[PDB]
Design a binder for this molecule. Structure first.
Ligand code: HEM
Ligand SMILES: N[C@@H](Cc1c[nH]c2ccccc12)C(=O)O
Length: 373
């Protein structure tokens, strides 16, 4: 449909781990980033690649793995060891197939949330559940970068939110079929699942070390939009003549919060302010089907105006339980970025925002939508 899975939501279900042998030289580099980066052989291995046609990628999951393989190589090539020795030109033999593949997938040619979180995972045992202990990432950047903890916990918050995203048909069908009790139960189940998602969020502390995250992983999640180290962006050699600017990876790119914002009539993207513009821009970094799902939600009748029109205190409280769960998620998320960014920085996000004013503006807009203070 909108490529939303019942079990894993916006995440890519059962991602492919292997490319055709035709792409072994790509897979080799992506699988050995920690060693190749540490030695300083990474950039040499990229510059020596043959130009490989993308036409031996024959399905969506192969294309998505290839985008993830190439995005990881690209971040590693641009940033190197992260100490300031950047590369301003992505070599032709990687830039052209990467940009061609990205154009086919309708995603910018930079590593995005949907690559390094949503498609970057496997079950260890396919017969066992989606728990951290039965899961692994497909690619990491450096030894000790906590990429497994960071990507898998982000993924598990996505999967937790999937149990709410499936209820969204019920919400709209119940509004149109004027089914008050069905709508109410639905809103309560959404809020219940958004509360579970917050509980899963606490696992960030279990699996991500602030120093490793800030000083190692963040380097490879950074983009080249408003980045002083690549002030003009990146040259995609052989594809575009002038450099292009693209934001780095972040869960601003996640569709989970934007989808419940839109669902609840929270006007995060309205106006010309910087918060609205960023959240708007980040939709360009979501898979096109998920972008389409968000816009579809925006066109539907307003859940807020329905609840507000009915003089129904049970409905208003169910709606408010949903808004409160978003508020709590975003308040807890302020604690996370304080621990993982602000504190380590003293010893801007990878997406490109002035993050603390941005994040509090988004939370404040969210709490503004409560029906009862
Ligand atoms: C170590 C953990 C995390 C850090 C340091 C972090 C950091 C950030 C930063 C700096 C931003 C501002 C946008 C940017 O410039 O990048 C942001 C936005 C955002 N993040 Fe996180 N993040 C973390 C984990 C998560 C997780 C696990 C989720 C949900 C799966 C999430 C959801 C969001 C959302 C939805 C936004 C957009 C702002 C909003 O909707 O309120 N973050 N994050
Ligand atoms: N924007 C975050 C990084 C981040 C948060 N969530 C993400 C999800 C995917 C990729 C990167 C991220 C930062 O500046 O640290």
């Amino acid at each position: 449909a909108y490529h939303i899975d019942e079990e894993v939501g916006f995440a890519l279900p059962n991602p492919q781990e292997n490319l055709p042998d035709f792409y072994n030289d790509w897979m080799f580099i992506a699988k050995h980033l920690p060693d190749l980066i540490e030695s300083g052989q990474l950039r040499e291995r990229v510059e020596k690649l043959n130009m490989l046609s993308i036409d031996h990628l024959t399905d969506h999951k192969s294309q998505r793995l290839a985008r993830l393989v190439l995005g990881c190589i690209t971040m590693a090539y641009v940033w190197g060891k992260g100490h300031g020795d950047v590369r301003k030109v992505l070599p032709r033999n990687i830039a052209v197939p990467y940009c061609q593949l990205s154009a086919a997938l309708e995603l910018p040619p930079i590593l995005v949330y949907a690559d390094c979180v949503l498609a970057n995972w496997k079950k260890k045992d396919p017969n066992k559940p989606l728990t951290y202990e039965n899961m692994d990432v497909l690619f990491s950047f450096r030894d000790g970068d906590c990429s497994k903890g960071f990507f898998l916990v982000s993924l598990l918050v996505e999967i937790a939110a999937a149990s709410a995203i499936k209820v969204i048909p019920t919400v709209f069908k119940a509004m149109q079929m004027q089914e008050r009790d069905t709508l109410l139960k639905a809103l309560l189940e959404i809020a219940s699942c958004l509360e579970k998602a917050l509980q899963v969020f606490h696992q960030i502390h279990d699996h991500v070390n602030p120093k490793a995250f800030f000083s190692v992983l963040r380097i490879y999640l950074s983009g080249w939009k408003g980045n002083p180290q690549l002030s003009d962006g990146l040259v995609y050699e052989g594809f575009w003549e002038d450099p292009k600017e693209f934001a780095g990876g972040s869960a601003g790119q996640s569709s989970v919060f934007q989808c419940f914002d839109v669902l609840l009539g929270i006007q995060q993207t309205a106006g010309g302010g910087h918060a609205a513009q960023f959240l708007q821009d980040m939709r360009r970094y979501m898979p096109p089907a998920h972008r389409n799902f968000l816009c579809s939600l925006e066109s539907n009748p307003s859940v807020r105006e329905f609840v507000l029109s009915k003089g129904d205190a049970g409905l208003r409280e169910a709606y408010d339980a949903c808004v409160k769960a978003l508020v709590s998620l975003r308040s807890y998320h302020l604690q996370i970025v304080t621990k993982y960014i602000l504190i380590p920085a003293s010893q801007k996000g990878t997406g490109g925002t002035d993050l603390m004013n941005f994040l509090k503006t988004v939370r404040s807009t969210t709490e503004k939508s409560l029906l009862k203070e």
